[PDB]
Design a protein around this ligand. Sequence first.
Ligand code: HEM
Length: 391
Amino acid sequence: AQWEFHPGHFWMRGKRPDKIVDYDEELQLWNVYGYPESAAILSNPKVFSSDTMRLDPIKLDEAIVEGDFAHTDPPKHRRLRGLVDHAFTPSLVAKMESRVHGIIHELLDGVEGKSQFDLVAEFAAPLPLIMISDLLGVPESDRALFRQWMDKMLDGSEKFESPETVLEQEEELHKELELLWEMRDYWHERAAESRKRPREDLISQLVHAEVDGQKLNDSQISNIANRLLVNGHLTTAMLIANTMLCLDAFSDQDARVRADRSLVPALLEESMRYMSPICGVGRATNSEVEVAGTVIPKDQLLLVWTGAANRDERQFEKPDVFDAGRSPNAHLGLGRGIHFCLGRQLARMESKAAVEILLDRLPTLRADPANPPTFLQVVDASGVATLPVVT
Ligand code: HEM
Protein backbone atom coordinates (compact mmCIF):
# COMPACT_ATOMS: atom_id res chain seq x y z
CA ALA A 1 0.00 0.00 0.00
CA GLN A 2 0.78 3.77 0.14
CA TRP A 3 3.50 3.23 2.78
CA GLU A 4 6.49 5.61 3.19
CA PHE A 5 9.38 3.23 2.46
CA HIS A 6 13.02 4.23 2.13
CA PRO A 7 13.21 5.85 -1.33
CA GLY A 8 15.92 3.38 -2.31
CA HIS A 9 13.65 0.37 -1.74
CA PHE A 10 12.06 0.17 -5.16
CA TRP A 11 11.04 -3.49 -4.67
CA MET A 12 8.60 -2.43 -1.92
CA ARG A 13 6.75 -0.27 -4.49
CA GLY A 14 6.35 -3.17 -6.93
CA LYS A 15 9.15 -2.14 -9.33
CA ARG A 16 11.42 -4.63 -11.07
CA PRO A 17 15.14 -3.76 -11.17
CA ASP A 18 16.17 -2.65 -14.66
CA LYS A 19 19.44 -4.58 -14.37
CA ILE A 20 20.19 -7.48 -12.05
CA VAL A 21 23.56 -5.79 -11.36
CA ASP A 22 24.47 -2.09 -11.44
CA TYR A 23 27.17 0.31 -10.24
CA ASP A 24 26.55 3.39 -8.12
CA GLU A 25 29.11 5.93 -9.38
CA GLU A 26 28.27 8.46 -6.67
CA LEU A 27 28.74 5.90 -3.84
CA GLN A 28 31.38 3.84 -5.67
CA LEU A 29 29.70 0.49 -5.05
CA TRP A 30 27.95 -2.34 -6.87
CA ASN A 31 24.34 -3.53 -6.41
CA VAL A 32 22.88 -7.07 -6.94
CA TYR A 33 19.06 -7.51 -6.99
CA GLY A 34 18.47 -11.02 -8.45
CA TYR A 35 17.67 -14.03 -6.27
CA PRO A 36 19.81 -16.74 -7.92
CA GLU A 37 22.78 -14.33 -8.12
CA SER A 38 22.42 -13.18 -4.48
CA ALA A 39 22.08 -16.73 -3.17
CA ALA A 40 25.19 -17.81 -5.06
CA ILE A 41 27.14 -14.79 -3.77
CA LEU A 42 26.23 -15.57 -0.14
CA SER A 43 27.36 -19.21 -0.71
CA ASN A 44 30.72 -18.13 -2.09
CA PRO A 45 32.51 -16.52 0.89
CA LYS A 46 36.01 -17.31 -0.46
CA VAL A 47 35.27 -14.94 -3.35
CA PHE A 48 32.77 -12.57 -1.63
CA SER A 49 34.24 -11.49 1.69
CA SER A 50 32.22 -10.34 4.67
CA ASP A 51 35.22 -8.31 5.88
CA THR A 52 34.09 -5.12 4.13
CA MET A 53 36.34 -2.84 6.24
CA ARG A 54 39.28 -4.30 4.31
CA LEU A 55 38.32 -1.84 1.50
CA ASP A 56 38.16 1.28 3.66
CA PRO A 57 41.03 3.75 3.29
CA ILE A 58 40.82 4.16 7.12
CA LYS A 59 40.27 1.12 9.30
CA LEU A 60 40.01 0.01 12.88
CA ASP A 61 42.82 -2.05 14.30
CA GLU A 62 42.14 -5.77 13.99
CA ALA A 63 42.65 -6.47 17.70
CA ILE A 64 39.81 -4.03 18.41
CA VAL A 65 37.25 -5.64 16.06
CA GLU A 66 38.13 -9.31 16.63
CA GLY A 67 35.30 -11.57 17.81
CA ASP A 68 32.82 -9.93 15.46
CA PHE A 69 32.42 -13.06 13.41
CA ALA A 70 29.79 -11.31 11.27
CA HIS A 71 32.73 -9.60 9.58
CA THR A 72 35.05 -12.57 9.76
CA ASP A 73 35.81 -15.01 6.89
CA PRO A 74 37.11 -18.57 6.85
CA PRO A 75 39.20 -20.13 8.26
CA LYS A 76 38.68 -18.11 11.44
CA HIS A 77 34.89 -17.67 11.14
CA ARG A 78 33.89 -21.23 12.04
CA ARG A 79 35.73 -21.25 15.39
CA LEU A 80 34.09 -18.02 16.53
CA ARG A 81 30.64 -18.85 15.26
CA GLY A 82 31.07 -22.32 16.75
CA LEU A 83 31.73 -21.13 20.33
CA VAL A 84 28.67 -18.91 20.35
CA ASP A 85 26.47 -21.58 18.76
CA HIS A 86 27.72 -24.00 21.36
CA ALA A 87 27.28 -21.37 24.03
CA PHE A 88 23.59 -21.44 23.22
CA THR A 89 23.22 -24.61 25.27
CA PRO A 90 19.98 -26.61 25.28
CA SER A 91 19.22 -25.36 28.83
CA LEU A 92 19.60 -21.74 27.79
CA VAL A 93 17.25 -22.13 24.86
CA ALA A 94 14.66 -23.82 27.07
CA LYS A 95 15.04 -21.14 29.71
CA MET A 96 14.55 -18.47 27.06
CA GLU A 97 11.33 -19.92 25.71
CA SER A 98 10.17 -20.46 29.28
CA ARG A 99 10.59 -16.72 29.89
CA VAL A 100 9.29 -15.13 26.71
CA HIS A 101 5.60 -15.48 27.50
CA GLY A 102 6.16 -13.96 30.92
CA ILE A 103 7.96 -10.98 29.36
CA ILE A 104 5.31 -10.47 26.73
CA HIS A 105 2.38 -10.51 29.14
CA GLU A 106 4.33 -8.12 31.35
CA LEU A 107 4.81 -5.73 28.47
CA LEU A 108 1.14 -5.77 27.51
CA ASP A 109 0.12 -5.36 31.13
CA GLY A 110 2.13 -2.17 30.76
CA VAL A 111 -0.22 -0.73 28.10
CA GLU A 112 -3.52 -2.03 29.57
CA GLY A 113 -4.90 1.49 30.23
CA LYS A 114 -3.97 2.76 26.77
CA SER A 115 -6.43 2.61 23.89
CA GLN A 116 -3.82 4.09 21.50
CA PHE A 117 -0.07 3.51 21.46
CA ASP A 118 3.09 2.75 19.51
CA LEU A 119 3.41 -1.00 19.13
CA VAL A 120 7.11 -0.71 18.30
CA ALA A 121 8.07 1.50 21.22
CA GLU A 122 5.76 -0.21 23.73
CA PHE A 123 6.11 -3.80 22.65
CA ALA A 124 7.95 -4.88 19.61
CA ALA A 125 11.31 -3.25 20.44
CA PRO A 126 11.48 -3.85 24.14
CA LEU A 127 10.77 -7.62 23.90
CA PRO A 128 13.81 -8.79 21.80
CA LEU A 129 15.99 -6.34 23.67
CA ILE A 130 14.87 -7.80 27.00
CA MET A 131 15.34 -11.40 25.76
CA ILE A 132 18.89 -10.83 24.66
CA SER A 133 19.71 -8.85 27.81
CA ASP A 134 18.52 -11.74 29.98
CA LEU A 135 20.38 -14.24 27.82
CA LEU A 136 23.59 -12.26 28.40
CA GLY A 137 22.74 -12.06 32.08
CA VAL A 138 22.83 -8.30 32.53
CA PRO A 139 20.71 -6.71 35.28
CA GLU A 140 17.49 -4.99 34.18
CA SER A 141 19.10 -1.60 34.96
CA ASP A 142 21.69 -2.28 32.21
CA ARG A 143 18.97 -2.68 29.57
CA ALA A 144 18.97 1.15 29.61
CA LEU A 145 22.66 1.33 28.77
CA PHE A 146 21.97 -0.91 25.75
CA ARG A 147 19.12 1.14 24.26
CA GLN A 148 21.47 4.13 24.52
CA TRP A 149 24.19 2.29 22.63
CA MET A 150 21.67 1.12 20.05
CA ASP A 151 20.71 4.63 18.99
CA LYS A 152 24.34 5.60 18.54
CA MET A 153 24.76 2.56 16.33
CA LEU A 154 21.42 3.30 14.61
CA ASP A 155 22.69 6.87 14.10
CA GLY A 156 25.98 5.75 12.61
CA SER A 157 24.06 3.28 10.47
CA GLU A 158 21.96 6.12 9.04
CA LYS A 159 23.34 8.20 6.17
CA PHE A 160 25.51 5.23 5.21
CA GLU A 161 24.04 5.65 1.71
CA SER A 162 25.42 9.16 1.38
CA PRO A 163 28.93 9.59 -0.04
CA GLU A 164 31.58 10.09 2.65
CA THR A 165 34.96 11.83 2.46
CA VAL A 166 38.00 10.16 3.96
CA LEU A 167 37.79 12.71 6.79
CA GLU A 168 34.10 12.09 7.52
CA GLN A 169 34.96 8.40 7.58
CA GLU A 170 37.69 9.17 10.09
CA GLU A 171 35.19 11.12 12.23
CA GLU A 172 32.65 8.30 12.23
CA LEU A 173 35.39 5.76 12.85
CA HIS A 174 36.53 7.67 15.93
CA LYS A 175 33.05 7.89 17.48
CA GLU A 176 32.68 4.13 16.75
CA LEU A 177 35.98 3.59 18.57
CA GLU A 178 34.90 5.54 21.65
CA LEU A 179 31.78 3.36 21.79
CA LEU A 180 33.77 0.14 21.43
CA TRP A 181 35.91 1.18 24.34
CA GLU A 182 32.92 1.89 26.52
CA MET A 183 31.41 -1.48 25.73
CA ARG A 184 34.68 -3.28 26.13
CA ASP A 185 35.03 -1.85 29.63
CA TYR A 186 31.45 -2.80 30.31
CA TRP A 187 31.80 -6.42 29.23
CA HIS A 188 35.09 -6.49 31.17
CA GLU A 189 33.14 -6.01 34.39
CA ARG A 190 30.43 -8.49 33.41
CA ALA A 191 33.14 -11.05 32.75
CA ALA A 192 34.76 -10.40 36.15
CA GLU A 193 31.40 -10.62 37.90
CA SER A 194 30.55 -13.82 36.04
CA ARG A 195 33.86 -15.36 37.07
CA LYS A 196 33.09 -14.24 40.65
CA ARG A 197 29.50 -15.57 40.47
CA PRO A 198 28.67 -17.77 37.45
CA ARG A 199 24.99 -17.88 36.44
CA GLU A 200 22.78 -19.53 33.81
CA ASP A 201 23.64 -17.09 31.05
CA LEU A 202 25.66 -16.72 27.87
CA ILE A 203 28.48 -14.64 29.44
CA SER A 204 29.14 -17.42 31.92
CA GLN A 205 29.56 -19.73 28.98
CA LEU A 206 31.84 -17.28 27.15
CA VAL A 207 34.40 -16.73 29.96
CA HIS A 208 35.23 -20.44 29.89
CA ALA A 209 35.23 -20.81 26.07
CA GLU A 210 38.56 -21.00 24.16
CA VAL A 211 40.02 -20.26 20.68
CA ASP A 212 43.38 -21.78 19.72
CA GLY A 213 43.42 -23.23 23.24
CA GLN A 214 43.23 -19.75 24.80
CA LYS A 215 40.20 -18.17 26.55
CA LEU A 216 38.58 -15.03 25.13
CA ASN A 217 39.66 -11.54 25.96
CA ASP A 218 37.54 -8.51 26.71
CA SER A 219 37.49 -7.42 23.10
CA GLN A 220 36.34 -10.82 21.83
CA ILE A 221 33.61 -11.07 24.47
CA SER A 222 32.54 -7.46 23.91
CA ASN A 223 32.37 -7.83 20.12
CA ILE A 224 30.38 -11.06 20.38
CA ALA A 225 27.87 -9.58 22.83
CA ASN A 226 27.60 -6.36 20.82
CA ARG A 227 26.94 -8.44 17.69
CA LEU A 228 24.15 -10.40 19.43
CA LEU A 229 22.52 -7.15 20.65
CA VAL A 230 22.78 -5.28 17.39
CA ASN A 231 21.76 -8.22 15.25
CA GLY A 232 18.94 -9.44 17.40
CA HIS A 233 17.20 -6.29 18.59
CA LEU A 234 15.63 -4.04 15.98
CA THR A 235 15.59 -6.81 13.34
CA THR A 236 13.25 -8.75 15.60
CA ALA A 237 11.26 -5.67 16.63
CA MET A 238 10.59 -5.07 12.94
CA LEU A 239 9.60 -8.62 12.12
CA ILE A 240 7.01 -8.40 14.91
CA ALA A 241 5.76 -4.96 13.92
CA ASN A 242 5.91 -5.54 10.09
CA THR A 243 3.91 -8.66 10.62
CA MET A 244 1.11 -6.90 12.52
CA LEU A 245 1.17 -4.09 9.90
CA CYS A 246 0.80 -6.61 7.07
CA LEU A 247 -2.08 -8.45 8.81
CA ASP A 248 -3.86 -5.11 9.24
CA ALA A 249 -3.26 -4.29 5.59
CA PHE A 250 -4.22 -7.70 4.18
CA SER A 251 -7.43 -8.57 5.98
CA ASP A 252 -7.89 -11.68 3.82
CA GLN A 253 -4.58 -13.01 5.10
CA ASP A 254 -5.48 -11.86 8.60
CA ALA A 255 -8.69 -13.87 8.44
CA ARG A 256 -6.77 -16.97 7.34
CA VAL A 257 -4.37 -16.75 10.25
CA ARG A 258 -7.05 -16.14 12.92
CA ALA A 259 -9.03 -19.14 11.54
CA ASP A 260 -5.98 -21.43 11.24
CA ARG A 261 -3.35 -20.61 13.91
CA SER A 262 -0.96 -23.21 12.52
CA LEU A 263 -0.16 -20.55 9.85
CA VAL A 264 1.74 -18.24 12.18
CA PRO A 265 5.27 -19.64 11.51
CA ALA A 266 4.73 -19.50 7.76
CA LEU A 267 3.29 -15.99 8.26
CA LEU A 268 6.49 -14.86 9.94
CA GLU A 269 8.65 -16.32 7.17
CA GLU A 270 6.50 -14.54 4.57
CA SER A 271 6.74 -11.36 6.62
CA MET A 272 10.54 -11.74 6.25
CA ARG A 273 10.33 -12.36 2.54
CA TYR A 274 7.99 -9.42 1.88
CA MET A 275 9.38 -6.76 4.20
CA SER A 276 12.86 -7.91 5.05
CA PRO A 277 14.15 -6.42 8.34
CA ILE A 278 17.63 -6.87 6.94
CA CYS A 279 17.06 -6.12 3.26
CA GLY A 280 20.67 -5.86 2.11
CA VAL A 281 24.08 -7.07 3.22
CA GLY A 282 27.57 -5.95 2.28
CA ARG A 283 30.28 -8.00 0.67
CA ALA A 284 33.76 -7.22 -0.64
CA THR A 285 35.19 -8.91 -3.73
CA ASN A 286 38.54 -10.67 -3.19
CA SER A 287 39.08 -11.23 -6.93
CA GLU A 288 37.53 -10.27 -10.27
CA VAL A 289 34.12 -11.91 -10.78
CA GLU A 290 31.25 -12.23 -13.20
CA VAL A 291 27.74 -11.64 -11.78
CA ALA A 292 24.64 -11.81 -13.99
CA GLY A 293 26.95 -11.37 -16.97
CA THR A 294 28.61 -8.30 -15.41
CA VAL A 295 32.29 -8.19 -14.54
CA ILE A 296 33.06 -6.91 -11.04
CA PRO A 297 36.69 -6.05 -10.33
CA LYS A 298 38.78 -7.13 -7.36
CA ASP A 299 38.39 -5.18 -4.10
CA GLN A 300 34.90 -3.76 -4.71
CA LEU A 301 32.07 -3.19 -2.26
CA LEU A 302 29.00 -5.23 -3.27
CA LEU A 303 25.57 -4.71 -1.77
CA VAL A 304 23.54 -7.88 -1.91
CA TRP A 305 19.87 -6.76 -1.83
CA THR A 306 18.19 -9.68 -0.10
CA GLY A 307 15.05 -7.51 0.11
CA ALA A 308 14.98 -7.19 -3.69
CA ALA A 309 15.99 -10.86 -4.22
CA ASN A 310 12.97 -11.77 -2.14
CA ARG A 311 10.71 -10.14 -4.72
CA ASP A 312 12.40 -11.98 -7.63
CA GLU A 313 9.72 -13.52 -9.84
CA ARG A 314 12.28 -16.10 -11.16
CA GLN A 315 12.19 -17.54 -7.60
CA PHE A 316 8.70 -16.77 -6.25
CA GLU A 317 5.30 -16.98 -7.90
CA LYS A 318 3.47 -13.66 -7.61
CA PRO A 319 6.29 -12.20 -5.49
CA ASP A 320 4.40 -8.98 -4.79
CA VAL A 321 1.51 -10.90 -3.23
CA PHE A 322 1.51 -11.39 0.54
CA ASP A 323 0.71 -15.08 1.17
CA ALA A 324 0.54 -15.91 4.90
CA GLY A 325 0.81 -19.59 4.14
CA ARG A 326 3.38 -19.29 1.40
CA SER A 327 5.30 -22.51 0.70
CA PRO A 328 7.91 -23.14 -0.26
CA ASN A 329 9.57 -19.96 0.99
CA ALA A 330 13.33 -20.09 0.76
CA HIS A 331 13.67 -16.36 1.29
CA LEU A 332 17.01 -14.67 2.02
CA GLY A 333 15.74 -12.71 5.03
CA LEU A 334 17.97 -14.70 7.32
CA GLY A 335 20.81 -14.92 4.89
CA ARG A 336 22.30 -18.08 3.41
CA GLY A 337 25.51 -20.02 3.97
CA ILE A 338 28.06 -19.70 6.71
CA HIS A 339 26.77 -16.36 7.96
CA PHE A 340 23.16 -17.70 8.15
CA CYS A 341 21.39 -16.03 11.08
CA LEU A 342 22.64 -17.52 14.34
CA GLY A 343 19.69 -16.22 16.30
CA ARG A 344 17.09 -17.57 13.83
CA GLN A 345 15.57 -20.02 16.36
CA LEU A 346 15.23 -17.36 19.08
CA ALA A 347 13.90 -14.78 16.60
CA ARG A 348 11.23 -17.16 15.31
CA MET A 349 10.35 -18.33 18.86
CA GLU A 350 9.93 -14.68 20.03
CA SER A 351 8.06 -13.39 17.07
CA LYS A 352 5.67 -16.37 17.05
CA ALA A 353 4.95 -15.96 20.76
CA ALA A 354 4.48 -12.23 20.28
CA VAL A 355 2.12 -12.42 17.36
CA GLU A 356 0.07 -15.19 18.94
CA ILE A 357 -0.31 -13.34 22.17
CA LEU A 358 -1.16 -10.04 20.40
CA LEU A 359 -3.87 -11.91 18.47
CA ASP A 360 -5.42 -13.44 21.61
CA ARG A 361 -5.15 -10.53 24.05
CA LEU A 362 -5.76 -7.65 21.58
CA PRO A 363 -7.91 -9.14 18.86
CA THR A 364 -9.26 -5.67 17.99
CA LEU A 365 -5.75 -4.25 17.54
CA ARG A 366 -5.62 -2.21 14.28
CA ALA A 367 -3.26 0.20 12.56
CA ASP A 368 -4.27 3.75 13.60
CA PRO A 369 -5.76 5.24 10.42
CA ALA A 370 -5.28 8.82 11.61
CA ASN A 371 -1.62 8.12 12.25
CA PRO A 372 0.32 5.97 9.74
CA PRO A 373 3.53 4.08 10.60
CA THR A 374 7.02 5.37 9.82
CA PHE A 375 9.76 3.19 8.40
CA LEU A 376 13.24 2.83 9.78
CA GLN A 377 15.59 5.44 8.29
CA VAL A 378 18.30 2.92 7.46
CA VAL A 379 19.01 1.77 3.93
CA ASP A 380 19.82 -1.90 4.71
CA ALA A 381 16.59 -2.38 6.62
CA SER A 382 13.07 -2.64 5.42
CA GLY A 383 10.69 -2.22 8.36
CA VAL A 384 8.56 0.08 10.51
CA ALA A 385 10.19 2.34 13.18
CA THR A 386 6.83 3.48 14.59
CA LEU A 387 3.54 1.68 14.53
CA PRO A 388 0.67 3.56 16.17
CA VAL A 389 -2.09 1.16 17.00
CA VAL A 390 -5.63 1.50 18.28
CA THR A 391 -7.69 -0.97 20.31
C1 HEM B 1 13.80 -11.09 12.37
C2 HEM B 1 14.94 -11.33 13.02
C3 HEM B 1 16.31 -11.45 12.35
C4 HEM B 1 16.65 -11.28 11.06
C5 HEM B 1 15.79 -10.92 9.84
C6 HEM B 1 18.07 -11.50 10.97
C7 HEM B 1 18.79 -11.42 9.82
C8 HEM B 1 20.07 -11.88 9.63
C9 HEM B 1 20.83 -11.96 8.37
C10 HEM B 1 20.33 -11.55 6.98
C11 HEM B 1 22.05 -12.44 8.66
C12 HEM B 1 23.18 -12.68 7.64
C13 HEM B 1 24.23 -11.56 7.69
C14 HEM B 1 25.20 -11.63 6.50
O1 HEM B 1 25.21 -12.61 5.74
O2 HEM B 1 26.02 -10.70 6.30
C15 HEM B 1 22.09 -12.69 10.10
C16 HEM B 1 23.13 -13.19 10.85
C17 HEM B 1 23.26 -13.15 12.22
N1 HEM B 1 22.25 -13.00 13.18
FE1 HEM B 1 20.42 -12.52 12.71
N2 HEM B 1 18.57 -11.78 12.24
C18 HEM B 1 17.51 -11.76 13.10
C19 HEM B 1 17.56 -12.03 14.46
C20 HEM B 1 18.68 -12.34 15.21
C21 HEM B 1 18.72 -12.61 16.67
C22 HEM B 1 17.47 -12.64 17.57
C23 HEM B 1 19.99 -12.84 16.97
C24 HEM B 1 20.70 -13.16 18.30
C25 HEM B 1 20.08 -13.33 19.46
C26 HEM B 1 20.75 -12.70 15.76
C27 HEM B 1 22.12 -12.86 15.64
C28 HEM B 1 22.80 -12.98 14.47
C29 HEM B 1 24.21 -13.18 14.39
C30 HEM B 1 25.23 -13.26 15.55
C31 HEM B 1 24.51 -13.31 12.91
C32 HEM B 1 25.91 -13.47 12.29
C33 HEM B 1 26.23 -14.94 12.08
C34 HEM B 1 27.52 -15.03 11.27
O3 HEM B 1 27.97 -14.01 10.70
O4 HEM B 1 28.09 -16.14 11.19
N3 HEM B 1 19.94 -12.39 14.74
N4 HEM B 1 20.88 -12.34 10.62
